[PDB]
Amino acid sequence: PALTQEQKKELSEIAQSIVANGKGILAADESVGTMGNRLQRIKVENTEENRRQFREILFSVDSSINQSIGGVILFHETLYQKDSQGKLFRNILKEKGIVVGIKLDGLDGLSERCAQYKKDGVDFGKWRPSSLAIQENANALARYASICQQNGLVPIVEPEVIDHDLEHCQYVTEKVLAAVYKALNDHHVYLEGTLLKPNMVTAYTPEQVAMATVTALHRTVPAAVPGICFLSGGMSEEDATLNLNAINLCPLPKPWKLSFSYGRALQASALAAWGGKAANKEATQEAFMKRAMANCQAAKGQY
Amino acid sequence: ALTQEQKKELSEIAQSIVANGKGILAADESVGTMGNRLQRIKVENTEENRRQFREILFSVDSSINQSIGGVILFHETLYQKDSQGKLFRNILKEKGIVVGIKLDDGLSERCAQYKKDGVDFGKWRPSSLAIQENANALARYASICQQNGLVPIVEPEVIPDDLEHCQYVTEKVLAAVYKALNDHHVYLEGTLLKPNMVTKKYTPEQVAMATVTALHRTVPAAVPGICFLSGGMSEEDATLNLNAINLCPLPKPWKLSFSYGRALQASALAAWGGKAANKEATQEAFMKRAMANCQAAKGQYVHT
């Protein structure tokens, strides 16, 4: 059921708007379990309620945020939560211009689950599924990505990350990404209405990390991909910025928006500034709003 | 196992070819072909007639090195000498231009040799299965050149059989190849691509869009340059389209040049008509098409 020019228009508008000016993506979709340690770390208990609380706070921050955040991904749960005044978390973000994202993380029930998701205000989906192996999750992605685009969703293709050297990690990422896109072509996936969520070729200063990241990236990632928001993963809010800055500085061809799709580097500080106490929204919305702008500048190199 | 040392080279050469709106001349016509050419100007096919015409081209003013950054050559020709016993090979080396040989098991041996002779880049052109073998051959040879310090001009394929049709095909055939080159770990930065142009009536606008689209869907931003082949197009159209493609409002991380033959020698060969009296005229039309296309490569070209 190949896309019609119209479906592309829609897809394109979205993927492009999730990075429109350097606006990265927020990883506010952690699992019931993950959120648990996150909140746990701050010397607090993991409970459904206390979630809607740290999430209502973030999505409530000044509207200026839509200058650093182009879209936010949510766990199933949050996509339905109502803020204090019974306001849908969904709409608190939509109104302010941010785009609704949904963790779709088996391709069974996806062409159905997505169809619904779109109706429920979601415009893009996240999902992460040896030569044999490498080709597997690839054809997989390819299908899942082809599915989202059928239900007006914008696939954020995530190529799984797998003690060696940078040069090593670089060769693997390259070898992988090549299979990812090759497969994706095989499945006639509108690259324009897509988005890549790769890892930073890391173990080595940010420049060296960005020089080995972009390189491997430009040798593999097609110009037609509107943007590539990185995943912080184990990088301090201060290193997920340094690196993403150098990346947007590395002296090489870079036809795609070199954005971010952070969670630990966008919440951490704003996560401590809460600690259960729901009156210090300032400290919270302070530590969150401080990183969204900063890492919005990493996506510009003006950092 | 390319060393950061040869990559250095492979690239310098890869880029020096497509520097500033500069393209490649394909004077590599194989005997039989070259005769078909001369035959159109009613000129007998002789080892000499060939040697002369091509002598005229390569003998054109050195300012020809502002439009032509590299010339390909056919076996025979790599060893012929101009009227004064001088070598086209070196006539071109000294004249700025880089010399390129046409290569088409024993390959890697030949290369090192053609490298010793002054050639710094070569060429070799070839169903789901089909395209795969093509892709992979084009990749073995690719790494064989870089092994022997040459810059592999990857040439894909396609059949004359609308626009969106030739496009969709081009993108497949092009993914097979850059994927191929990856499985074989080909230093993409020491490469060059000679794609066809994705081409119901069509304006350079479209013919260029359909094309650049497909190109930025498949060909990596690491490839330093895409030198389109004009096969079939008039010298004029090869230019309108190379210009068009160069102005297309799309992303283009790579130089979009020309690696023309018919499009560059066409007129320059008809004005000579095999009469050594017109060496003058000939060199004009060449120089003319030579600069003309460079402009198209800068998108800076105007038809009147």
Side-chain angles (χ1 to χ4, degrees), chain A residues 87-122:
Chain A
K87 181 93 175 186
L88 287 170
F89 273 54
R90 161 195 326 187
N91 297 306
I92 302 173
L93 294 184
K94 189 172 306 163
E95 196 149 358
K96 303 189 185 183
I98 291 185
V99 192
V100 193
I102 197 67
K103 209 174 192 175
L104 290 189
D105 196 282
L107 314 183
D108 200 59
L110 227 43
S111 169
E112 302 77 51
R113 262 141 53 192
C114 293
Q116 188 65 7
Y117 272 125
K118 185 65 177 180
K119 303 168 173 59
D120 288 51
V122 198

Side-chain angles (χ1 to χ4, degrees), chain A:
Chain A
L3 298 163
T4 47
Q5 182 60 197
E6 191 167 60
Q7 299 182 284
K8 299 168 182 173
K9 174 181 180 169
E10 182 163 62
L11 298 146
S12 181
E13 296 185 40
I14 313 182
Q16 252 178 173
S17 51
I18 305 179
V19 293
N21 294 149
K23 289 173 296 179
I25 316 182
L26 183 68
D29 66 322
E30 291 110 310
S31 67
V32 180
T34 297
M35 197 65 272
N37 354 294
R38 293 292 168 289
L39 300 163
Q40 237 159 55
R41 300 176 177 182
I42 49 176
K43 299 173 65 180
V44 177
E45 194 197 5
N46 177 190
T47 303
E48 214 288 301
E49 179 55 46
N50 13 302
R51 269 190 281 278
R52 210 183 68 54
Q53 312 198 68
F54 189 71
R55 296 184 171 176
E56 180 174 0
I57 291 186
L58 300 167
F59 315 5
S60 72
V61 90
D62 192 310
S63 73
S64 77
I65 201 190
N66 62 44
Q67 300 299 274
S68 291
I69 297 297
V72 174
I73 302 177
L74 306 167
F75 201 49
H76 193 184
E77 170 178 296
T78 316
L79 177 58
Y80 292 84
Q81 295 185 297
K82 302 205 169 193
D83 87 350
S84 296
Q85 293 83 52
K87 181 93 175 186
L88 287 170
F89 273 54
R90 161 195 326 187
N91 297 306
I92 302 173
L93 294 184
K94 189 172 306 163
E95 196 149 358
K96 303 189 185 183
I98 291 185
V99 192
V100 193
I102 197 67
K103 209 174 192 175
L104 290 189
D105 196 282
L107 314 183
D108 200 59
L110 227 43
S111 169
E112 302 77 51
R113 262 141 53 192
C114 293
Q116 188 65 7
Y117 272 125
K118 185 65 177 180
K119 303 168 173 59
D120 288 51
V122 198
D123 296 294
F124 83 98
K126 176 182 177 183
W127 157 297
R128 48 189 182 189
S130 184
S131 319
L132 187 65
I134 257 146
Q135 186 179 68
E136 284 302 38
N137 72 180
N139 315 307
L141 282 168
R143 309 170 211 165
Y144 131 60
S146 177
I147 298 177
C148 306
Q149 314 199 326
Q150 273 290 186
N151 313 308
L153 290 193
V154 151
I156 285 193
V157 180
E158 209 176 333
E160 186 199 308
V161 189
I162 61 180
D163 81 65
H164 283 76
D165 43 306
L166 216 62
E167 173 182 350
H168 181 79
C169 182
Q170 188 178 311
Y171 171 32
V172 230
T173 308
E174 282 173 40
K175 242 192 61 178
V176 182
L177 287 168
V180 183
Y181 281 100
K182 165 59 192 312
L184 268 137
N185 181 309
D186 279 50
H187 288 283
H188 198 46
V189 194
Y190 197 72
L191 308 186
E192 278 70 297
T194 241
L195 283 166
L196 176 58
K197 182 151 189 178
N199 60 72
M200 310 193 154
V201 168
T202 67
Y204 276 175
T205 55
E207 300 60 57
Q208 301 182 295
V209 180
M211 178 52 212
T213 300
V214 186
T215 267
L217 280 159
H218 96 306
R219 301 203 198 172
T220 45
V221 187
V225 155
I228 90 169
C229 326
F230 296 78
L231 68 74
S232 54
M235 308 187 303
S236 58
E237 303 183 302
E238 204 39 47
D239 277 304
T241 319
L242 306 180
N243 289 8
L244 175 50
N245 200 57
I247 282 182
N248 243 150
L249 283 171
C250 182
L252 283 72
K254 301 174 287 174
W256 2 261
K257 283 289 181 177
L258 289 176
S259 198
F260 64 85
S261 194
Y262 297 178
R264 343 305 167 315
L266 287 170
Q267 298 175 353
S269 54
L271 189 63
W274 183 68
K277 311 179 178 58
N280 346 314
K281 307 166 191 177
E282 287 217 49
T284 300
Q285 311 203 180
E286 178 56 5
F288 164 48
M289 199 58 132
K290 183 188 178 193
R291 308 311 296 160
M293 295 182 254
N295 289 308
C296 147
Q297 305 179 64
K300 287 198 169 197
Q302 316 165 306
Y303 192 78

Side-chain angles (χ1 to χ4, degrees), chain B residues 211-223:
Chain B
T211 291
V212 184
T213 277
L215 276 189
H216 90 307
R217 308 266 222 181
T218 57
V219 187
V223 174

